[PDB]
Design a protein around this ligand. Sequence first.
Ligand code: HEM
Ligand code: HEM
Lengths: 152, 152
Amino acid sequence: MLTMQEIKAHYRFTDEDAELLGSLFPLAETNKERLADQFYDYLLGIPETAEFLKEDLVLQKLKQTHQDWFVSLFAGSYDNRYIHNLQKIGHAHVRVGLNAHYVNVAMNVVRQFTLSIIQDNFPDPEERRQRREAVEKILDINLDIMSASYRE
Amino acid sequence: MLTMQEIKAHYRFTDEDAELLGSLFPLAETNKERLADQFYDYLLGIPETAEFLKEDLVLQKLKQTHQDWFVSLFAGSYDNRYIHNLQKIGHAHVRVGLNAHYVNVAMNVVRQFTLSIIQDNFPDPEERRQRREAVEKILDINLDIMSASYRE
Ligand code: HEM
Ligand code: HEM
């Protein structure tokens, strides 16, 4: 279960999926600020998550921190270093007192945004299917490892 | 645990999403045996999950149990009874001893299958978008509540 190789096998994530995520890097990068604004504004709309963004109003760091994570989904090198880093990300949220429910909530926001980029840029059905399948795997892997930080 | 109303607000799940899911019920009904076979075969194909299907071998009651859950996604009405039932579903996996990682894996299988039904049956880009968005919300809400069952 615990190694990256094992996790990839369970999700049937292969080098083809990694190549497809790399092929989406330019679109993700083009759209990174739109993603960051929509992500940040959605959180500002829920009082419970809005709390965590009060100090950030002045510090002005957290929009960039989550923007950078989004870009990393497409950066390649999905290896044991990548999983270790996700475990760290998960624990950061546990440490500040964020309920895991809001991680699931946030991940829905990213998922809808990214699938809309795919729908809007890939008219060919099988190109679209393959890119959607790769993105759903990486988002689900991210959510899986982060969720496990609340248990472990 | 949160109320259905609060969960819907966090996921921006509206009466329109509930109506779209209800409208997918006949489509679900005509794909349910294909879903049930693919879901059960995927679990047989990982040794860790296949261990939990040993007792089920002869009559495959669990294949039906999982099929029935899939069709229930498309009931078109969702209130506190639906959240309570998801807690019961999560708890059933906790009590048999299944690591929650495999619930995330299985939800990716169902997600990919269901989004292919949407792509394969809805040529109109906006009809597709709206149905995909409703499906991703209800799957993410199921995953969210089931995950919560593993936290004291
Ligand atoms: C898709 C879900 C999420 C992902 C992938 C994510 C990603 C990250 C990353 C990469 C970091 C930097 C952690 C580190 O390396 O130290 C971080 C920190 C942080 N995130 Fe998130 N995040 C998510 C959801 C949320 C939500 C919903 C909130 C609520 C407002 C939030 C608030 C925070 C805060 C407050 C920190 C800094 C913790 C500290 O002060 O040490 N995150 N997040
Ligand atoms: C999308 C993820 C899954 C969903 C939505 C789901 C759904 C369900 C439902 C609705 C039940 C009946 C619960 C009840 O009313 O008592 C159940 C039971 C069960 N499921 Fe799943 N399931 C999922 C993943 C899995 C996985 C990955 C396995 C691994 C083999 C599994 C094995 C079982 C077993 C063994 C039971 C019976 C537990 C008992 O003895 O009561 N399920 N599931």
